[PDB]
Design an enzyme around this catalytic site. Structure first.
Site, PDB file in Angstrom:
ATOM      1  N   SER A  42       0.866  -1.072   0.334  1.00 38.99           N
ATOM      2  CA  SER A  42       0.026   0.273  -0.377  1.00 38.99           C
ATOM      3  C   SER A  42       0.976   1.352  -0.140  1.00 38.99           C
ATOM      4  CB  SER A  42      -0.646  -0.061   1.439  1.00 38.99           C
ATOM      5  OG  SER A  42      -2.021  -0.755   1.230  1.00 38.99           O
ATOM      6  N   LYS A  89       0.199   4.686  -1.674  1.00 39.74           N
ATOM      7  CA  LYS A  89      -1.491   5.116  -2.273  1.00 39.74           C
ATOM      8  C   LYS A  89      -0.615   6.677  -0.964  1.00 39.74           C
ATOM      9  CE  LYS A  89      -4.356   1.345  -0.512  1.00 39.74           C
ATOM     10  NZ  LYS A  89      -4.069   0.597   0.218  1.00 39.74           N
ATOM     11  N   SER A 126      -5.544   3.761   4.138  1.00 40.22           N
ATOM     12  CA  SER A 126      -4.960   2.645   3.136  1.00 40.22           C
ATOM     13  C   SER A 126      -5.857   1.948   2.820  1.00 40.22           C
ATOM     14  CB  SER A 126      -4.043   1.636   3.941  1.00 40.22           C
ATOM     15  OG  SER A 126      -3.210   0.879   2.671  1.00 40.22           O
ATOM     16  N   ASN A 141      -8.828   1.169  -0.033  1.00 42.96           N
ATOM     17  CA  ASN A 141      -8.350   0.091  -1.074  1.00 42.96           C
ATOM     18  C   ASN A 141      -9.557   0.418  -1.730  1.00 42.96           C
ATOM     19  OD1 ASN A 141      -6.026  -1.592  -1.144  1.00 42.96           O
ATOM     20  ND2 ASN A 141      -7.066  -3.039  -0.559  1.00 42.96           N
ATOM     21  N   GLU A 197      -4.361  -7.443  -5.913  1.00 42.19           N
ATOM     22  CA  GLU A 197      -3.835  -8.496  -6.715  1.00 42.19           C
ATOM     23  C   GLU A 197      -2.306  -7.746  -6.769  1.00 42.19           C
ATOM     24  OE1 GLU A 197      -6.420  -7.020  -8.947  1.00 42.19           O
ATOM     25  OE2 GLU A 197      -5.306  -6.460 -10.172  1.00 42.19           O
ATOM     26  N   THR A 227       2.151   3.259   5.444  1.00 38.65           N
ATOM     27  CA  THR A 227       2.997   1.688   4.958  1.00 38.65           C
ATOM     28  C   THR A 227       2.213   1.415   4.141  1.00 38.65           C
ATOM     29  OG1 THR A 227       0.364   2.017   6.338  1.00 38.65           O
ATOM     30  CG2 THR A 227       2.637   2.225   7.397  1.00 38.65           C
ATOM     31  N   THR A 255       1.342  -3.654   3.808  1.00 38.63           N
ATOM     32  CA  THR A 255       1.709  -5.095   4.346  1.00 38.63           C
ATOM     33  C   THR A 255       1.512  -5.521   3.291  1.00 38.63           C
ATOM     34  OG1 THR A 255       1.041  -3.759   6.392  1.00 38.63           O
ATOM     35  CG2 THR A 255       0.711  -5.864   6.350  1.00 38.63           C
TER      36      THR A 255
END
Ligand code: NA
Ligand code: NA
Ligand code: NA
Ligand code: NA
Ligand code: NA
Ligand code: NA
Ligand code: NA
Ligand code: NA
Ligand code: NA
Ligand code: NA
Ligand code: NA
Length: 271
Positions: free
Chosen positions: A47, A50, A107, A109, A146, A213, A215
């Protein structure tokens, strides 16, 4: 002056204990002192892209007056996991600024994919923006989720610690964004909510930190990059990326924090 070899050997012991690879790059923006370890090796972005996506949106808004206040509706959209803000606001839609804030600070999506779809031109478009600021290393190839596959030695959806740090420095202190837009970006980084156990954990509670961050959820793969504003010192730009060889291995926030501590100790900062 802590010899760089000393810093490198501390990181080698740390990554050996962690069971994987740790890559770091840091820049002192007052002295131009730098430090790197595995700084030109590729690691998955997860991520972390972003934050750069939010920057791409702000850049776009400099040539499209009014863009940030526009609303995007997605009432019948299939929503991705880890979309806390966009799932909550589906009945109302969200403004472009709200999506940008959510994708960076939470974060989110759905927010990332919505901005990639409607404004930035997909992973290709994200990549082109990075090229436009002089980053020839970053590559975004796939969408959320993905892009998290983090397969050993797959260069898709990767960058290097050096390129991440250099791009953060460019956006935070360089010429890409105007003053108002640059302030907005860095306020979003400052209010990030997911990094308390990573680079922020390596510095005193009263220093100011902006970070994003990443992950991936597999291959012990996680990261953080930041601008750090110490008391009475120029800001520092830092990127810390990790990986492990086994798919089911977990990442370690502690290891990222400790890598950050080792690298920062090498700058001549009052703490
Ligand atoms: Na050594
Ligand atoms: Na622009
Ligand atoms: Na603007
Ligand atoms: Na918001
Ligand atoms: Na590419
Ligand atoms: Na593809
Ligand atoms: Na720069
Ligand atoms: Na000072
Ligand atoms: Na500053
Ligand atoms: Na690795
Ligand atoms: Na192995």
């Amino acid at each position: 002056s802590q010899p760089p070899q000393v810093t490198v050997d501390k990181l080698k012991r740390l990554e050996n204990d962690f069971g994987g690879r740790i890559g770091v790059y840091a820049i002192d923006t007052g002295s131009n002192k730098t430090f790197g370890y595995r700084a030109n090796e590729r690691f998955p972005l997860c991520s972390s892209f972003k934050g750069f996506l939010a920057a791409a949106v702000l850049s776009k808004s400099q040539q499209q007056e009014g863009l940030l206040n526009q609303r995007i509706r997605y009432d019948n959209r299939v929503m991705e996991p880890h979309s806390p803000v966009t799932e909550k606001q589906i009945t109302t839609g969200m403004t472009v600024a709200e999506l940008s804030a959510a994708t960076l600070q939470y974060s989110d999506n759905g927010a990332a994919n919505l901005l990639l779809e409607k404004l930035i031109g997909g992973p290709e478009g994200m990549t082109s923006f990075m090229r436009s600021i002089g980053d020839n290393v970053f590559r975004l190839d796939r969408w959320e989720l993905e892009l998290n596959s983090a397969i050993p030695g797959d260069d898709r959806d990767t960058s290097t610690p050096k390129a991440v740090a250099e791009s953060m420095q460019k956006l935070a202190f360089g010429n890409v964004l105007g003053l108002t837009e640059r302030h907005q970006l860095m306020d979003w980084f400052k209010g990030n909510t997911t990094g308390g156990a990573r680079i922020r954990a390596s510095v005193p509670a009263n220093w100011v930190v902006g970070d994003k961050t990443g992950t991936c959820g597999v291959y012990g793969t996680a990261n953080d990059y930041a601008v750090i504003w110490p008391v009475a010192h120029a800001p520092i730009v830092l990127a810390v990326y990790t990986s492990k060889p086994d798919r089911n291995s977990k990442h370690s926030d502690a290891v990222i924090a400790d890598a950050s501590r080792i690298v920062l100790e090498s700058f001549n900062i009052d703490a």
